[PDB]
Design a protein around this ligand. Structure first.
Ligand SMILES: O=c1[nH]cnc2c1ncn2[C@@H]1O[C@H](CO)[C@@H](O)[C@H]1O
Lengths: 215, 211
């Protein structure tokens, strides 16, 4: 019994109406009790999940009125009539027809104007080189939407191994995303090449945003 | 009704861990106790439950063999025992009570973090990130264990234009980077320093960013 949620992320504006869907691979309706065994849970960062809706459409005590669940059989929906700041969370559907299985979750994010990444590239520090290591670091800061790709090139050739990547969550202040990418090699390897390039691909630019340093 | 779980766990591969979950405010044996796994950046995975009345446990296929649910009913405590740990076991584990009206997980514990690594406690190396209208600086905090490290800029005085990237665990050690953006007219004129702390190793490091 597989639970499938879409979209995986959902850009919203405060105050507007939001809808997210859950589909089951098999019907969740108990004919014997005309009961659809499908619940909705909210999980904000760092917190434990919280039950919002059960039996597909019954609101848990205390849960505000702007949350409604609907649907039946294999197609279900969670609606937030007017979205508040306090509602940005991950929402999970969970079936309890046959065992208790969660869907993959839909994350609410704040929409805003598209922003191209600011790309910075940093040579290794003198103090790291004295240790024998050498990390080249690329920051892709304050972009929107969240999808982005980064490519490293050394002396004009694409490099894939040694690359470590990290992604922030949406920033609470300007609603943008950021990415860090670290290329780790030895001092000797680093001193063999001359040109280090970090190239970003993002929907705000028809060409890659490239930044580099020599030597 | 409250469910309180035990504290975070650090383990090497192969060992066992036992997590507890103490329940209060309700008749313990009237409701099932459930365990849910959540890997760091992933979703929720129901693991199974145990009937508190009769003590029989039920495991989903992925959790058969190595995992043990147990109870001490007189103390209203449920236990999760994970034997032969792997790195894929690194996750937060929640206990949660099952309410039969709805068949839902209505009250949850706060979660217990388990990290599996062959690393021993290791202090980080901290390195400045210097370039080459606005200028972006950074610090690289590399090769430490366990989490957390904390990073501030100018002893906390620098607030906006700062963000810190989530640590990633690669080859049993963590690495993270911080970023600060300041007006190009203010650096290197006004000094910028990253303050890094690693409590597990009592490490405190202040690193000035120089051009
Ligand atoms: O806490 C619990 N966790 C999991 N299953 C439970 C719990 N309590 C009752 N049931 C079981 O859920 C079935 C319907 O999905 C019921 O038949 C019951 O045996």
């Amino acid at each position: 019994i597989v639970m499938s949620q879409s979209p995986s992320a959902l850009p919203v504006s405060v105050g507007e109406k939001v809808t997210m869907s859950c589909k089951s691979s098999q019907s969740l309706l108990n004919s014997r009790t005309r009961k659809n065994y499908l619940a909705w849970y909210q999980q904000k960062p760092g917190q434990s999940p919280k039950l919002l809706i059960y039996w597909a459409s019954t609101r848990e005590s205390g849960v505000p009125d702007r949350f409604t669940g609907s649907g039946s059989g294999t197609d279900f929906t969670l609606t937030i009539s007017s979205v508040q700041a306090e509602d940005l969370a991950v929402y999970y559907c969970k079936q309890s027809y046959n065992l208790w299985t969660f869907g993959g979750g839909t994350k609410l994010e704040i929409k805003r104007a598209d922003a191209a990444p600011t790309v910075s590239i940093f040579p290794p520090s003198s103090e790291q080189l004295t240790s024998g290591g050498a990390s080249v670091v690329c920051f892709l800061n304050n972009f929107y939407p969240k999808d982005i790709n980064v490519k490293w090139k050394i002396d004009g050739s694409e490099r894939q191994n040694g690359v470590l990547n990290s992604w922030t969550d949406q920033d609470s202040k300007d609603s943008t995303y950021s990415m860090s990418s670290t290329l780790t090699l030895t001092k000797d390897e680093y001193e063999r090449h001359n040109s280090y390039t970090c190239e970003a691909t993002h929907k705000t630019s028809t060409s890659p945003i490239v930044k580099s340093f020599n030597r | 009704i409250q469910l309180v779980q035990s504290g975070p766990e650090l383990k090497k591969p192969g060992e066992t861990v036992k997590i507890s979950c103490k329940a209060s405010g309700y008749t313990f044996t009237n409701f099932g106790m459930n365990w849910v796994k959540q890997a760091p950046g992933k979703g929720l995975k129901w693991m199974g439950w145990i009937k508190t009345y009769t003590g029989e446990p039920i495991y989903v296929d992925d959790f058969k063999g190595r995992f043990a649910f147990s109870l001490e009913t007189s103390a209203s405590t449920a236990y999760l025992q994970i034997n032969t740990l792997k790195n894929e076991d690194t996750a937060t584990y929640f206990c949660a009570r099952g309410r039969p009206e709805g068949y839902v997980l209505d009250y949850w514990g706060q979660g217990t973090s388990v990290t599996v690594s062959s690393a021993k406690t290791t202090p980080p190396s901290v390195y400045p990130l210097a370039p080459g209208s606005m200028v972006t600086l950074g610090c690289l905090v590399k090769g430490y264990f366990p989490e957390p490290v904390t990073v501030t800029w100018n002893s906390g005085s620098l607030s906006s234009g700062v963000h810190t990237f989530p640590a990633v665990l690669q080859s049993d050690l963590y690495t993270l980077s911080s970023s600060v953006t300041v007006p190009s007219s203010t650096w290197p004129s006004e000094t910028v320093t990253c303050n890094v702390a690693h409590p597990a190793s009592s490490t405190k490091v202040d690193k000035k960013i120089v051009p």
